[PDB]
Amino acid sequence: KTTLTAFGFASADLIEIGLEGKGFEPTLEALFGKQGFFPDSVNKALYWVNGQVPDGVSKVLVDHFGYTKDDKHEQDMVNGIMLSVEKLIKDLKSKE
């Protein structure tokens, strides 16, 4: 929002766009929470996909998505991504 006072002492809101919403936190956590889609999905993709991102990007990825070096699951790329998808689907209707 912005209020303009350029007509002497007469004021007038030049423009205002009002955003109102609730229930964002559950989706925020289902995307980036402990069981969120992004952390597990990125971890599985990094484990099953050859090659590592530059070290600078690697630090951020480890910090945010909790990439794990070693996994004992002979489950494949498809199941690795699909576990994250499954938990996200449960996240969707398990909350607001």
Side-chain angles (χ1 to χ4, degrees):
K1 68 195 306 313
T2 184
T3 313
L4 176 57
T5 62
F7 299 97
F9 293 126
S11 182
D13 184 74
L14 189 62
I15 184 174
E16 182 280 336
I17 299 169
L19 312 180
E20 295 147 7
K22 64 91 175 179
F24 294 115
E25 163 176 356
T27 299
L28 295 175
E29 303 194 311
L31 292 172
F32 297 93
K34 308 303 179 72
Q35 305 195 288
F37 172 76
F38 286 122
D40 288 327
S41 193
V42 170
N43 182 17
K44 295 287 185 173
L46 289 169
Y47 178 76
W48 287 120
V49 176
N50 304 137
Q52 280 296 328
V53 299
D55 303 333
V57 180
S58 185
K59 306 190 196 296
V60 178
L61 294 191
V62 166
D63 180 31
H64 285 174
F65 305 121
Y67 153 71
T68 72
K69 291 167 59 169
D70 202 348
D71 186 5
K72 309 307 188 181
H73 289 88
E74 298 290 356
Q75 214 196 5
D76 210 19
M77 186 66 203
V78 296
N79 292 21
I81 298 292
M82 185 63 72
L83 288 164
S84 73
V85 171
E86 185 261 304
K87 56 184 60 176
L88 180 60
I89 295 167
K90 203 42 51 183
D91 270 355
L92 172 59
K93 271 305 310 172
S94 50
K95 69 201 181 297
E96 190 276 355

Coordinates of all heavy atoms in Angstrom, one line a residue:
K1 N 0.8 -1.2 0.0 CA 0.0 0.0 0.0 C 0.9 1.2 0.0 O 2.0 1.2 0.5 CB -0.9 0.0 1.2 CG -0.2 0.2 2.5 CD -1.1 -0.1 3.7 CE -2.4 0.6 3.7 NZ -2.2 2.1 3.4
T2 N 0.4 2.3 -0.6 CA 1.0 3.6 -0.6 C 0.0 4.7 -0.5 O -1.0 4.7 -1.2 CB 1.9 3.8 -1.8 OG1 2.7 5.0 -1.7 CG2 1.1 3.8 -3.1
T3 N 0.3 5.7 0.3 CA -0.6 6.9 0.5 C 0.1 8.1 0.0 O 1.2 8.4 0.4 CB -1.0 7.1 2.0 OG1 -1.4 5.8 2.5 CG2 -2.2 8.0 2.1
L4 N -0.6 8.8 -0.9 CA 0.0 10.0 -1.6 C -0.7 11.2 -1.0 O -1.9 11.3 -0.9 CB -0.2 9.9 -3.1 CG 0.3 11.1 -3.9 CD1 1.7 11.4 -3.6 CD2 0.0 10.9 -5.4
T5 N 0.1 12.2 -0.7 CA -0.4 13.5 -0.3 C 0.3 14.6 -1.2 O 1.3 15.2 -0.8 CB 0.0 13.8 1.2 OG1 1.4 13.8 1.4 CG2 -0.6 12.7 2.1
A6 N -0.3 14.9 -2.3 CA 0.2 15.8 -3.3 C -0.9 16.8 -3.8 O -0.7 17.3 -4.9 CB 0.9 15.1 -4.4
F7 N -2.0 16.9 -3.1 CA -3.1 17.8 -3.5 C -3.3 18.9 -2.5 O -4.4 19.2 -2.1 CB -4.3 17.0 -3.7 CG -4.2 16.0 -4.8 CD1 -3.9 14.6 -4.5 CD2 -4.4 16.3 -6.1 CE1 -3.8 13.7 -5.5 CE2 -4.3 15.3 -7.1 CZ -4.0 14.0 -6.8
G8 N -2.2 19.5 -2.0 CA -2.3 20.4 -0.8 C -2.2 19.6 0.5 O -1.1 19.0 0.8
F9 N -3.3 19.5 1.2 CA -3.4 18.7 2.4 C -4.3 17.5 2.2 O -4.6 16.7 3.1 CB -3.8 19.5 3.6 CG -2.8 20.5 4.1 CD1 -3.2 21.8 4.2 CD2 -1.5 20.1 4.4 CE1 -2.3 22.8 4.7 CE2 -0.6 21.0 4.8 CZ -1.0 22.4 4.9
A10 N -4.9 17.3 1.0 CA -5.7 16.2 0.7 C -4.9 15.0 0.4 O -4.0 15.0 -0.5 CB -6.7 16.5 -0.5
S11 N -5.2 13.9 1.1 CA -4.5 12.6 0.9 C -5.4 11.6 0.1 O -6.6 11.7 0.0 CB -4.2 12.0 2.3 OG -3.5 10.8 2.1
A12 N -4.7 10.7 -0.6 CA -5.4 9.7 -1.4 C -4.4 8.5 -1.6 O -3.3 8.7 -2.0 CB -5.8 10.3 -2.7
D13 N -4.9 7.3 -1.2 CA -4.1 6.1 -1.4 C -3.9 5.9 -2.9 O -4.9 5.6 -3.6 CB -4.9 4.9 -0.8 CG -4.0 3.6 -0.9 OD1 -3.0 3.5 -0.2 OD2 -4.4 2.8 -1.7
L14 N -2.7 6.0 -3.3 CA -2.4 5.9 -4.8 C -2.7 4.4 -5.2 O -3.3 4.3 -6.3 CB -0.9 6.2 -5.0 CG -0.5 6.3 -6.5 CD1 -1.3 7.4 -7.2 CD2 1.0 6.5 -6.6
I15 N -2.4 3.4 -4.4 CA -2.7 2.0 -4.8 C -2.6 1.2 -3.5 O -1.8 1.5 -2.6 CB -1.8 1.5 -5.9 CG1 -2.2 0.1 -6.3 CG2 -0.4 1.5 -5.5 CD1 -1.5 -0.4 -7.5
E16 N -3.4 0.1 -3.5 CA -3.3 -0.8 -2.4 C -3.8 -2.2 -2.9 O -4.8 -2.3 -3.5 CB -4.2 -0.4 -1.2 CG -4.1 -1.4 0.0 CD -4.9 -2.6 -0.2 OE1 -5.9 -2.6 -0.9 OE2 -4.6 -3.6 0.5
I17 N -2.9 -3.2 -2.7 CA -3.3 -4.6 -3.0 C -3.2 -5.4 -1.7 O -2.1 -5.5 -1.1 CB -2.4 -5.2 -4.0 CG1 -2.5 -4.4 -5.4 CG2 -2.7 -6.7 -4.3 CD1 -1.4 -4.8 -6.4
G18 N -4.3 -5.9 -1.2 CA -4.4 -6.5 0.1 C -4.5 -8.0 -0.1 O -5.4 -8.6 -0.8
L19 N -3.5 -8.7 0.5 CA -3.5 -10.2 0.5 C -3.8 -10.7 1.9 O -3.2 -10.3 2.9 CB -2.1 -10.7 0.1 CG -1.4 -10.0 -1.1 CD1 -0.1 -10.6 -1.4 CD2 -2.3 -10.2 -2.3
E20 N -4.9 -11.6 1.9 CA -5.3 -12.2 3.2 C -5.4 -13.7 3.0 O -5.9 -14.1 1.9 CB -6.7 -11.6 3.6 CG -6.6 -10.2 4.0 CD -7.9 -9.4 3.7 OE1 -8.9 -10.1 3.3 OE2 -8.0 -8.2 3.8
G21 N -4.9 -14.4 3.9 CA -4.9 -15.9 3.8 C -4.5 -16.5 5.2 O -3.9 -15.9 6.0
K22 N -4.8 -17.8 5.3 CA -4.5 -18.5 6.5 C -4.3 -20.0 6.1 O -4.6 -20.4 5.0 CB -5.7 -18.4 7.5 CG -7.0 -19.0 7.1 CD -7.1 -20.5 7.4 CE -8.5 -21.0 7.1 NZ -8.7 -22.5 7.4
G23 N -3.7 -20.7 7.0 CA -3.4 -22.1 6.8 C -2.2 -22.3 5.9 O -2.0 -23.4 5.3
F24 N -1.3 -21.3 5.8 CA -0.1 -21.4 4.9 C 0.9 -22.3 5.6 O 1.6 -23.1 5.0 CB 0.5 -20.1 4.6 CG -0.4 -19.2 3.7 CD1 -1.0 -18.1 4.2 CD2 -0.7 -19.6 2.4 CE1 -1.8 -17.3 3.4 CE2 -1.5 -18.9 1.6 CZ -2.1 -17.7 2.1
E25 N 1.1 -22.2 7.0 CA 2.1 -22.9 7.7 C 2.1 -24.4 7.4 O 3.2 -25.0 7.3 CB 1.9 -22.6 9.2 CG 2.7 -23.6 10.1 CD 2.6 -23.2 11.6 OE1 2.0 -22.1 11.9 OE2 3.0 -24.0 12.4
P26 N 0.9 -25.1 7.5 CA 0.9 -26.5 7.2 C 1.5 -26.9 5.9 O 2.3 -27.8 5.8 CB -0.5 -26.9 7.3 CG -1.3 -25.6 7.3 CD -0.4 -24.6 7.9
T27 N 1.2 -26.1 4.8 CA 1.8 -26.4 3.5 C 3.2 -26.0 3.5 O 4.0 -26.8 2.9 CB 1.0 -25.6 2.4 OG1 -0.4 -26.0 2.4 CG2 1.6 -25.8 1.0
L28 N 3.6 -25.0 4.1 CA 5.1 -24.6 4.2 C 5.9 -25.8 4.8 O 6.9 -26.1 4.3 CB 5.2 -23.3 5.1 CG 4.6 -22.0 4.5 CD1 4.8 -20.9 5.5 CD2 5.3 -21.7 3.2
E29 N 5.3 -26.4 5.9 CA 6.1 -27.5 6.5 C 6.0 -28.8 5.7 O 6.9 -29.5 5.7 CB 5.5 -27.7 7.9 CG 5.6 -26.4 8.8 CD 5.4 -26.7 10.3 OE1 4.5 -27.4 10.6 OE2 6.3 -26.2 11.1
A30 N 4.8 -29.0 5.0 CA 4.7 -30.2 4.2 C 5.7 -30.1 3.0 O 6.0 -31.1 2.4 CB 3.3 -30.4 3.7
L31 N 6.1 -28.8 2.6 CA 7.0 -28.7 1.5 C 8.5 -28.7 2.1 O 9.3 -29.3 1.4 CB 6.8 -27.3 0.8 CG 5.5 -27.3 0.0 CD1 5.3 -25.8 -0.5 CD2 5.5 -28.2 -1.2
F32 N 8.7 -28.1 3.2 CA 10.1 -27.9 3.7 C 10.2 -28.4 5.2 O 11.3 -28.1 5.8 CB 10.5 -26.4 3.6 CG 10.6 -25.9 2.2 CD1 9.5 -25.3 1.7 CD2 11.7 -26.0 1.5 CE1 9.5 -24.8 0.4 CE2 11.8 -25.6 0.2 CZ 10.7 -24.9 -0.4
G33 N 9.3 -29.1 5.7 CA 9.4 -29.6 7.1 C 10.3 -30.9 7.2 O 10.9 -31.3 6.2
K34 N 10.2 -31.5 8.4 CA 11.0 -32.7 8.6 C 10.6 -33.8 7.7 O 11.4 -34.5 7.1 CB 10.9 -33.1 10.0 CG 11.2 -32.0 11.1 CD 12.6 -31.4 10.8 CE 12.9 -30.3 11.8 NZ 13.1 -30.8 13.2
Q35 N 9.3 -34.0 7.5 CA 8.7 -34.9 6.6 C 8.3 -34.2 5.3 O 7.5 -34.8 4.5 CB 7.5 -35.7 7.2 CG 7.9 -36.4 8.5 CD 6.8 -37.4 8.9 OE1 5.7 -37.0 9.3 NE2 7.1 -38.7 8.8
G36 N 8.8 -33.0 5.0 CA 8.4 -32.3 3.8 C 8.8 -33.0 2.6 O 9.7 -33.8 2.5
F37 N 8.2 -32.6 1.5 CA 8.5 -33.2 0.2 C 9.9 -32.9 -0.3 O 10.7 -33.7 -0.7 CB 7.5 -32.7 -0.9 CG 7.8 -33.1 -2.3 CD1 7.6 -34.4 -2.7 CD2 8.4 -32.2 -3.2 CE1 7.9 -34.8 -4.0 CE2 8.7 -32.6 -4.5 CZ 8.5 -33.9 -4.9
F38 N 10.3 -31.6 -0.2 CA 11.5 -31.1 -0.8 C 12.7 -31.8 -0.1 O 13.6 -32.3 -0.9 CB 11.6 -29.6 -0.7 CG 10.8 -28.9 -1.7 CD1 9.8 -28.0 -1.2 CD2 10.9 -29.1 -3.0 CE1 9.0 -27.3 -2.1 CE2 10.1 -28.4 -3.9 CZ 9.2 -27.5 -3.5
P39 N 12.9 -31.9 1.2 CA 14.1 -32.5 1.8 C 14.3 -33.9 1.4 O 15.3 -34.3 0.9 CB 13.8 -32.4 3.3 CG 12.9 -31.2 3.4 CD 12.0 -31.3 2.2
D40 N 13.2 -34.8 1.5 CA 13.4 -36.2 1.2 C 13.6 -36.4 -0.3 O 14.4 -37.2 -0.7 CB 12.1 -37.0 1.7 CG 12.1 -37.1 3.2 OD1 13.2 -37.2 3.8 OD2 11.0 -37.1 3.8
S41 N 12.8 -35.6 -1.1 CA 13.0 -35.7 -2.6 C 14.4 -35.4 -3.0 O 15.0 -36.1 -3.8 CB 12.0 -34.8 -3.3 OG 11.9 -35.1 -4.6
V42 N 14.9 -34.3 -2.5 CA 16.3 -33.9 -2.9 C 17.3 -34.9 -2.4 O 18.3 -35.2 -3.1 CB 16.6 -32.5 -2.3 CG1 18.1 -32.1 -2.5 CG2 15.7 -31.4 -3.0
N43 N 17.1 -35.4 -1.2 CA 18.0 -36.4 -0.6 C 18.1 -37.6 -1.5 O 19.1 -38.1 -1.9 CB 17.6 -36.8 0.8 CG 18.6 -37.8 1.4 OD1 19.7 -38.0 1.0 ND2 18.1 -38.4 2.5
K44 N 16.9 -38.2 -1.8 CA 16.8 -39.4 -2.7 C 17.4 -39.1 -4.1 O 18.2 -39.9 -4.6 CB 15.4 -39.9 -2.8 CG 14.8 -40.3 -1.4 CD 15.4 -41.6 -1.0 CE 14.7 -42.2 0.3 NZ 15.2 -43.5 0.6
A45 N 17.1 -38.0 -4.7 CA 17.6 -37.7 -6.0 C 19.1 -37.6 -6.0 O 19.8 -38.1 -6.9 CB 17.0 -36.4 -6.5
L46 N 19.7 -36.9 -5.0 CA 21.1 -36.8 -4.9 C 21.8 -38.1 -4.7 O 22.8 -38.4 -5.3 CB 21.5 -35.8 -3.7 CG 21.2 -34.3 -4.0 CD1 21.4 -33.5 -2.7 CD2 22.1 -33.8 -5.1
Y47 N 21.2 -39.0 -3.8 CA 21.8 -40.3 -3.6 C 21.7 -41.1 -4.9 O 22.7 -41.8 -5.2 CB 21.0 -41.0 -2.5 CG 21.5 -42.4 -2.2 CD1 22.7 -42.6 -1.5 CD2 20.8 -43.5 -2.7 CE1 23.2 -43.9 -1.3 CE2 21.3 -44.8 -2.5 CZ 22.5 -45.0 -1.8 OH 23.0 -46.2 -1.5
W48 N 20.6 -41.1 -5.6 CA 20.5 -42.0 -6.8 C 21.0 -41.5 -8.0 O 21.2 -42.2 -9.0 CB 19.0 -42.4 -7.0 CG 18.4 -43.3 -5.9 CD1 17.4 -43.1 -5.1 CD2 18.9 -44.7 -5.7 NE1 17.2 -44.2 -4.3 CE2 18.1 -45.2 -4.6 CE3 19.9 -45.5 -6.2 CZ2 18.3 -46.5 -4.1 CZ3 20.1 -46.7 -5.7 CH2 19.3 -47.2 -4.6
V49 N 21.3 -40.2 -8.1 CA 21.8 -39.5 -9.3 C 23.3 -39.3 -9.2 O 23.7 -38.7 -8.2 CB 21.1 -38.2 -9.6 CG1 21.6 -37.5 -10.8 CG2 19.6 -38.5 -9.8
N50 N 24.1 -39.7 -10.2 CA 25.5 -39.5 -10.1 C 25.9 -38.0 -10.2 O 25.1 -37.2 -10.8 CB 26.2 -40.3 -11.3 CG 25.8 -41.8 -11.3 OD1 25.5 -42.4 -12.3 ND2 25.8 -42.4 -10.1
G51 N 27.0 -37.7 -9.7 CA 27.5 -36.3 -9.7 C 27.0 -35.5 -8.5 O 25.9 -35.7 -8.0
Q52 N 27.8 -34.5 -8.1 CA 27.5 -33.6 -7.0 C 27.6 -32.2 -7.5 O 28.4 -31.8 -8.3 CB 28.4 -33.8 -5.8 CG 28.1 -35.0 -5.0 CD 26.7 -34.9 -4.3 OE1 26.3 -33.8 -3.9 NE2 26.0 -36.0 -4.0
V53 N 26.7 -31.3 -6.9 CA 26.7 -29.9 -7.3 C 27.9 -29.3 -6.7 O 28.6 -29.8 -5.8 CB 25.4 -29.2 -6.7 CG1 24.2 -29.9 -7.3 CG2 25.4 -29.3 -5.2
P54 N 28.3 -28.1 -7.2 CA 29.5 -27.4 -6.7 C 29.5 -27.3 -5.1 O 28.4 -27.4 -4.5 CB 29.4 -26.0 -7.3 CG 28.7 -26.2 -8.6 CD 27.7 -27.3 -8.3
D55 N 30.6 -27.1 -4.5 CA 30.7 -27.2 -3.1 C 29.8 -26.1 -2.4 O 29.1 -26.4 -1.4 CB 32.2 -27.1 -2.6 CG 33.1 -28.1 -3.2 OD1 32.6 -29.2 -3.5 OD2 34.3 -27.8 -3.4
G56 N 29.9 -24.9 -3.0 CA 29.0 -23.8 -2.4 C 27.6 -24.2 -2.4 O 26.9 -24.0 -1.4
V57 N 27.1 -24.7 -3.5 CA 25.7 -25.1 -3.6 C 25.5 -26.4 -2.7 O 24.4 -26.6 -2.2 CB 25.3 -25.4 -5.1 CG1 23.8 -25.9 -5.1 CG2 25.5 -24.2 -5.9
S58 N 26.5 -27.2 -2.6 CA 26.4 -28.4 -1.8 C 26.1 -28.1 -0.3 O 25.3 -28.7 0.3 CB 27.7 -29.3 -1.9 OG 27.5 -30.5 -1.2
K59 N 26.8 -27.0 0.2 CA 26.6 -26.6 1.6 C 25.1 -26.3 1.8 O 24.5 -26.7 2.7 CB 27.5 -25.5 1.9 CG 29.0 -25.7 1.7 CD 29.8 -24.6 2.3 CE 31.2 -24.6 1.7 NZ 32.0 -25.8 2.1
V60 N 24.6 -25.4 0.9 CA 23.2 -25.0 1.0 C 22.2 -26.2 0.9 O 21.3 -26.3 1.7 CB 22.8 -23.9 0.0 CG1 21.4 -23.5 0.1 CG2 23.8 -22.7 0.1
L61 N 22.5 -27.1 0.0 CA 21.6 -28.3 -0.2 C 21.6 -29.1 1.1 O 20.6 -29.6 1.5 CB 22.0 -29.1 -1.4 CG 21.8 -28.4 -2.8 CD1 22.0 -29.4 -3.9 CD2 20.4 -27.7 -2.9
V62 N 22.8 -29.3 1.6 CA 22.9 -30.1 2.8 C 22.2 -29.5 4.0 O 21.5 -30.1 4.7 CB 24.4 -30.4 3.2 CG1 24.5 -30.9 4.6 CG2 25.0 -31.4 2.2
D63 N 22.4 -28.1 4.1 CA 21.8 -27.4 5.2 C 20.3 -27.5 5.1 O 19.6 -27.7 6.2 CB 22.3 -26.0 5.2 CG 21.7 -25.2 6.4 OD1 21.4 -25.8 7.4 OD2 21.5 -23.9 6.2
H64 N 19.7 -27.3 3.9 CA 18.3 -27.1 3.8 C 17.5 -28.4 3.7 O 16.5 -28.6 4.3 CB 17.9 -26.2 2.6 CG 18.2 -24.7 2.9 ND1 18.1 -23.8 1.9 CD2 18.6 -24.1 4.0 CE1 18.4 -22.6 2.4 NE2 18.7 -22.8 3.7
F65 N 18.0 -29.3 2.8 CA 17.3 -30.6 2.5 C 17.9 -31.8 3.2 O 17.4 -32.9 3.0 CB 17.4 -30.8 1.0 CG 16.8 -29.6 0.2 CD1 17.6 -28.9 -0.7 CD2 15.5 -29.2 0.4 CE1 17.1 -27.9 -1.4 CE2 15.0 -28.1 -0.3 CZ 15.8 -27.4 -1.2
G66 N 19.0 -31.6 4.0 CA 19.5 -32.8 4.7 C 20.0 -33.9 3.9 O 19.6 -35.1 4.2
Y67 N 20.7 -33.7 2.8 CA 21.2 -34.7 2.0 C 22.1 -35.7 2.8 O 22.9 -35.3 3.6 CB 22.1 -34.1 0.9 CG 23.1 -35.1 0.3 CD1 22.8 -36.2 -0.4 CD2 24.5 -34.9 0.6 CE1 23.7 -37.1 -0.9 CE2 25.5 -35.8 0.1 CZ 25.1 -36.8 -0.6 OH 26.0 -37.7 -1.1
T68 N 21.8 -37.0 2.5 CA 22.5 -38.1 3.2 C 23.4 -38.8 2.2 O 23.0 -39.2 1.1 CB 21.5 -39.1 3.8 OG1 20.9 -39.8 2.8 CG2 20.5 -38.3 4.7
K69 N 24.7 -39.1 2.6 CA 25.6 -39.6 1.7 C 25.3 -41.1 1.4 O 25.3 -41.5 0.2 CB 27.0 -39.5 2.2 CG 27.6 -38.1 2.3 CD 28.8 -38.0 3.1 CE 29.9 -38.8 2.6 NZ 31.2 -38.5 3.3
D70 N 25.0 -41.9 2.4 CA 24.9 -43.3 2.3 C 23.5 -43.7 2.6 O 22.9 -43.3 3.6 CB 25.9 -44.1 3.2 CG 26.1 -45.5 2.8 OD1 25.4 -46.0 1.9 OD2 27.1 -46.1 3.3
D71 N 22.9 -44.6 1.8 CA 21.6 -45.2 2.0 C 21.6 -46.7 1.7 O 22.2 -47.1 0.7 CB 20.5 -44.5 1.2 CG 19.1 -45.0 1.5 OD1 18.9 -45.8 2.4 OD2 18.2 -44.5 0.8
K72 N 21.0 -47.5 2.6 CA 21.1 -48.9 2.4 C 19.9 -49.5 1.7 O 19.6 -50.7 1.7 CB 21.2 -49.6 3.8 CG 22.3 -49.0 4.7 CD 23.6 -49.1 4.0 CE 24.8 -48.7 4.9 NZ 26.1 -48.7 4.2
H73 N 19.1 -48.6 1.0 CA 17.9 -49.0 0.3 C 18.2 -49.3 -1.2 O 18.6 -48.4 -1.9 CB 16.8 -48.0 0.4 CG 16.2 -47.9 1.8 ND1 16.8 -47.1 2.8 CD2 15.2 -48.5 2.4 CE1 16.1 -47.2 3.9 NE2 15.1 -48.0 3.7
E74 N 18.0 -50.6 -1.6 CA 18.1 -50.9 -3.0 C 16.7 -50.7 -3.6 O 16.0 -51.7 -4.0 CB 18.6 -52.3 -3.2 CG 20.0 -52.6 -2.7 CD 21.1 -51.9 -3.5 OE1 20.7 -51.3 -4.6 OE2 22.3 -51.9 -3.2
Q75 N 16.3 -49.4 -3.7 CA 14.9 -49.1 -4.0 C 14.8 -48.3 -5.3 O 13.6 -48.3 -5.8 CB 14.3 -48.3 -2.9 CG 12.8 -48.5 -2.7 CD 12.1 -47.4 -1.8 OE1 12.8 -46.4 -1.5 NE2 10.9 -47.6 -1.5
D76 N 15.8 -47.8 -5.9 CA 15.8 -47.2 -7.2 C 15.3 -45.7 -7.2 O 14.7 -45.3 -6.2 CB 15.0 -48.0 -8.2 CG 15.5 -47.9 -9.6 OD1 16.7 -47.5 -9.8 OD2 14.7 -48.2 -10.5
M77 N 15.6 -45.0 -8.2 CA 15.3 -43.6 -8.4 C 13.8 -43.4 -8.3 O 13.3 -42.4 -7.6 CB 15.8 -43.0 -9.7 CG 15.7 -41.5 -9.9 SD 16.6 -40.5 -8.8 CE 15.7 -39.0 -8.9
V78 N 13.0 -44.2 -9.0 CA 11.5 -44.0 -9.0 C 10.9 -44.1 -7.6 O 10.2 -43.2 -7.2 CB 10.9 -45.1 -10.0 CG1 11.4 -44.8 -11.4 CG2 11.2 -46.5 -9.5
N79 N 11.3 -45.2 -6.9 CA 10.8 -45.3 -5.5 C 11.3 -44.2 -4.6 O 10.6 -43.8 -3.7 CB 11.1 -46.7 -5.0 CG 10.3 -47.8 -5.7 OD1 9.9 -47.6 -6.8 ND2 10.2 -48.9 -5.0
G80 N 12.6 -43.8 -4.8 CA 13.1 -42.7 -4.0 C 12.3 -41.4 -4.1 O 12.0 -40.8 -3.1
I81 N 12.0 -41.0 -5.3 CA 11.2 -39.8 -5.5 C 9.7 -40.1 -5.0 O 9.1 -39.2 -4.5 CB 11.2 -39.4 -7.0 CG1 12.6 -39.0 -7.4 CG2 10.2 -38.2 -7.2 CD1 13.1 -37.7 -6.7
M82 N 9.3 -41.3 -5.2 CA 7.9 -41.6 -5.0 C 7.5 -41.7 -3.5 O 6.4 -41.5 -3.1 CB 7.5 -42.9 -5.7 CG 6.0 -43.2 -5.7 SD 5.0 -41.9 -6.5 CE 5.4 -42.2 -8.2
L83 N 8.5 -42.0 -2.7 CA 8.3 -42.0 -1.2 C 8.0 -40.5 -0.8 O 7.1 -40.3 0.0 CB 9.5 -42.5 -0.5 CG 9.8 -44.0 -0.6 CD1 11.2 -44.4 -0.1 CD2 8.7 -44.8 0.3
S84 N 8.8 -39.6 -1.3 CA 8.6 -38.2 -1.0 C 7.2 -37.8 -1.5 O 6.4 -37.1 -0.8 CB 9.6 -37.3 -1.6 OG 9.5 -37.2 -3.1
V85 N 6.8 -38.2 -2.7 CA 5.5 -37.9 -3.3 C 4.4 -38.5 -2.4 O 3.4 -37.8 -2.1 CB 5.4 -38.4 -4.7 CG1 3.9 -38.3 -5.2 CG2 6.3 -37.7 -5.7
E86 N 4.6 -39.7 -1.9 CA 3.6 -40.3 -1.1 C 3.4 -39.6 0.2 O 2.3 -39.3 0.7 CB 4.0 -41.8 -0.8 CG 3.1 -42.6 0.0 CD 3.4 -42.7 1.4 OE1 4.5 -43.1 1.8 OE2 2.5 -42.4 2.3
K87 N 4.5 -39.2 0.9 CA 4.4 -38.5 2.2 C 3.8 -37.1 1.9 O 3.1 -36.6 2.8 CB 5.8 -38.4 2.8 CG 6.9 -37.8 2.0 CD 8.2 -37.8 2.7 CE 8.7 -39.2 3.0 NZ 10.0 -39.2 3.6
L88 N 4.1 -36.5 0.8 CA 3.5 -35.2 0.5 C 2.0 -35.3 0.3 O 1.2 -34.5 0.7 CB 4.1 -34.6 -0.7 CG 3.5 -33.2 -1.1 CD1 3.7 -32.2 0.0 CD2 4.2 -32.7 -2.4
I89 N 1.5 -36.4 -0.4 CA 0.1 -36.6 -0.5 C -0.6 -36.8 0.8 O -1.7 -36.2 1.0 CB -0.2 -37.8 -1.5 CG1 0.4 -37.6 -2.9 CG2 -1.6 -38.1 -1.5 CD1 0.5 -38.8 -3.8
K90 N 0.0 -37.6 1.7 CA -0.6 -37.7 3.0 C -0.6 -36.3 3.7 O -1.5 -36.0 4.4 CB 0.2 -38.8 3.9 CG -0.7 -39.4 5.0 CD -2.1 -39.7 4.7 CE -2.4 -40.5 3.5 NZ -3.8 -40.7 3.3
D91 N 0.5 -35.6 3.6 CA 0.6 -34.2 4.1 C -0.6 -33.4 3.7 O -1.2 -32.6 4.5 CB 1.9 -33.6 3.8 CG 3.0 -33.8 4.7 OD1 2.7 -34.4 5.8 OD2 4.1 -33.4 4.5
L92 N -1.0 -33.5 2.4 CA -2.0 -32.6 1.8 C -3.3 -32.7 2.6 O -3.8 -31.6 3.0 CB -2.2 -33.0 0.3 CG -3.3 -32.3 -0.4 CD1 -3.1 -30.8 -0.3 CD2 -3.5 -32.8 -1.8
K93 N -3.9 -33.9 2.8 CA -5.2 -34.0 3.4 C -5.1 -34.4 4.8 O -6.2 -34.7 5.4 CB -6.0 -35.0 2.6 CG -6.8 -34.5 1.4 CD -7.8 -33.3 1.9 CE -8.6 -33.7 3.1 NZ -9.4 -32.5 3.6
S94 N -3.9 -34.5 5.4 CA -3.8 -34.7 6.8 C -3.8 -33.5 7.7 O -3.6 -33.5 8.9 CB -2.4 -35.5 7.1 OG -1.4 -34.8 6.5
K95 N -4.1 -32.3 7.0 CA -4.1 -31.0 7.7 C -4.8 -30.0 6.8 O -5.4 -30.4 5.8 CB -2.6 -30.6 8.0 CG -1.9 -30.2 6.7 CD -0.4 -30.2 6.9 CE 0.4 -29.8 5.7 NZ 0.1 -30.8 4.6
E96 N -4.8 -28.8 7.3 CA -5.6 -27.7 6.6 C -4.9 -27.4 5.2 O -3.7 -27.5 5.1 CB -5.6 -26.5 7.5 CG -6.5 -25.4 7.0 CD -5.9 -24.5 5.9 OE1 -4.7 -24.7 5.6 OE2 -6.6 -23.6 5.4

